[PDB]
């Protein structure tokens, strides 16, 4: 969904925080 298909999603807390690819 973008968070774990860039090298931004998942160094943004909310990817990290919902998404569990994060």
Same mark, same amino acid.
């Given at each position: 969904? &973008?968070? =774990?298909? &860039?090298? +931004? &999603?998942? %160094? %943004? +807390?909310? =990817? @990290?925080?919902?998404? @569990? =690819? =994060?």
């Amino acid at each position: 969904q &973008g968070c =774990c298909n &860039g090298p +931004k &999603g998942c %160094s %943004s +807390k909310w =990817c @990290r925080d919902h998404a @569990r =690819c =994060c």
